[PDB]
Amino acid sequence: ARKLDIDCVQAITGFDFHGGYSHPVTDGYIVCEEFKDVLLTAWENEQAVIERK
Amino acid sequence: FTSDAKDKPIGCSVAISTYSMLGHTTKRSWEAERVMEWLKTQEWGLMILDEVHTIPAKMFRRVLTIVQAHCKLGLTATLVREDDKIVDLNFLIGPKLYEANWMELQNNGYIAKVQCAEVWCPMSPEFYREYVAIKTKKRILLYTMNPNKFRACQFLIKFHERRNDKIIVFADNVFALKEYAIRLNKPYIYGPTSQGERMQILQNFKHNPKINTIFISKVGDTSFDLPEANVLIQISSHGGSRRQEAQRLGRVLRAKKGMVAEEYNAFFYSLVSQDTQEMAYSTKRQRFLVDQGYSFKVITKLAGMEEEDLAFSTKEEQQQLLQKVLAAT
DNA sequence: AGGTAGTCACAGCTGATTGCGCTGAGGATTAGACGTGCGATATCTATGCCA
DNA sequence: TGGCATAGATATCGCACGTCTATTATCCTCAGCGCAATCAGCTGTGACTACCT
What we know:
- Chain B: ATP binds at residues 251, 254.
- Chain B: This is General transcription and DNA repair factor IIH helicase/translocase subunit XPB.
- Chain B: Belongs to the helicase family. RAD25/XPB subfamily.
- This is part of a larger assembly, with chains A (53 residues) and B (329 residues).
- Chain A has 53 residues and is an alpha+beta fold.
- Helices cover 32% and strands 30% of the residues of chain A.
- In chain A, strand 1 and strand 2 (23-30) form a beta hairpin.
- Helices cover 39% and strands 15% of the residues of chain B.
- Chain B has helices spanning 19-23, 30-41, 58-66, 89-92, 102-108, 125-133, 140-144, 147-162, 174-184, 195-207, 244-252, 277-285, 287-291, 315-327; strands spanning 44-50, 69-75, 114-121, 167-171, 188-189, 213-216, 231-236, 266-273, 297-299.
- Chain B has a seven-stranded parallel β-sheet with strand order 5-6-4-7-8-3-9, with helices on both faces. In chain B, strands 1-2 form a two-stranded parallel ribbon.
- The structure holds a DNA duplex (51 and 53 nucleotides).
């Protein structure tokens, strides 16, 4: 997303605390709905590229 | 204003950061962007820059344009950048305000009166033949791995440990540092330098008397804090950085009580391989220290090496070492 | 036949190269509740005191 | 004969003594940038030779 300069944020889900501190817990990235499938295509391309790399 | 310990810029009377934190051309973290906006909005009565010799670099020079401050003051140990990019610095910050006489400060006892020495190490015939055979930049490994140089360093370490001295050994080459420290079985710090374990090793040197021999890579220049020491042994250097290793010597050796009356209370050794290009570097480098009146007495041979048993006594070990070195081209 | 411009063979200047350092994203990581144990404490009534 | 104090018998509520899972913002790693002595190619200069007079 940053490579393609797409505004992507984390998706704060809850809180986890292993040693006594409530770190926020995120599940995936929130993005704009317009680039949803474009981001999927980019992820597929990068997955294949990293496989061959 | 670092990436690890983050603090609110508001109400921060004195903000401490690094050039990289201001030199990030790439996108920073979102909070970092806000702090940079706060800094740019705020106008500073005073700005302080440390290690001025690194400023003339283009990215760090852009920082001065980035920040709007009234009074900028620079402090450092040296001002001779080997790329002669110092004339511009005269207007990047301003005129050189002051420069204390090193020998005068030695006389006043504000700093230790250093005992400088350059130790010449003969080249093994096989090593020297290989060194002459190669003509490119790859020659660095061979003379930095001179068996006689290894023996000299080992003898110095043994002698100063028997004297109970703080031994810090520098080696700019990564591979040479690893091999030397491992064979001598002493702590080594290089590129990885896990900061927690780095400070662990530093405190072990500071507090544990059993371990008083620390091997440090090029990161010992400015990447961390050097505890005060008394014996500094430099094996490999950048290759002409007359200011870098002189600054390393100045930072390593500090004022120590007990031997202030004596004119030699700090000991510095520079190992140089004979008939190599390294000699041409050393005379090129210590020139800066000559400008401060420091002298370097040539020590071709070390007294006492014969009786004490050292490594590589047999050449059969030395040819295996040559095998190892040539394996890495 | 005569001399200085075109052409080729070497020199200074500077950019690319190769060791090495640093941030940003990314994947790992005992304080009110709920009871009881002990301890201070309200609590109810036999019953014989002598008017 | 009868009014009721005075202590025997008994829980009773308060203060104090055990556990328990979370009314909310960490710790290392790899990729992306940077810095300083070679080395090599662009450009300048001299040696050798062509052409107009």
